[PDB]
Amino acid sequence: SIFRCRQCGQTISRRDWLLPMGGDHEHVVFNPAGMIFRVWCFSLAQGLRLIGAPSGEFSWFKGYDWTIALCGQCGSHLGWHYEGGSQPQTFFGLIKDRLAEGPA
Numbered sequence: 001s002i003f004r005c006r007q008c009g010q011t012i013s014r015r016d017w018l019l020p021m022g023g024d025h026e027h028v029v030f031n032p033a034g035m036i037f038r039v040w041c042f043s044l045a046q047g048l049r050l051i052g053a054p055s056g057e058f059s060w061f062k063g064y065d066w067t068i069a070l071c072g073q074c075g076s077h078l079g080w081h082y083e084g085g086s087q088p089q090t091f092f093g094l095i096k097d098r099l100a101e102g103p104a
């Protein structure tokens with residue numbers, strides 16, 4: 001029902017807020033360092049700290065620029081916030097295995 005940061009327990013998001021971007025909330029992707037991420041898309045999230053300036057470089061989602069999303073509490077890299085696109089303008093792509101699911 002809710003998703004917390006796996007490292008410290010910070011409240012991050014909810015199952016109800018999963019978003020099927022391109023028909024699926026799950027997207028498996030790699031960055032230029034070859035790191036594989038299983039990214040779940042969410043319409044909304046909280047408890048994050050978004051860092052740096054948005055960048056389109058290597059964006060996995062056409063038309064969106066990303067900013068890195070850290071856990072606001074412990075600093076763990078939890079994913080990205082996506083903006084500058086259309087339908088929707090913004091969303092979060094969070095790394096599934098950095099989250100823990102549990103009761104509200």
Ligand SMILES: O=C1C[C@H](NC(=O)c2c(Cl)cc(Cl)cc2Cl)C(=O)N1
Nearest residue numbers: 030031032058059060061066068080
């Ligand atoms: O949509 C995205 C987000 C994802 N970005 C990254 O992994 C990334 C890059 Cl490329 C550079 C730095 Cl300095 C830090 C990070 Cl976290 C990517 O490659 N495509």
Ligand SMILES: [Zn+2]
Nearest residue numbers: 005008071074
């Ligand atoms: Zn945390």
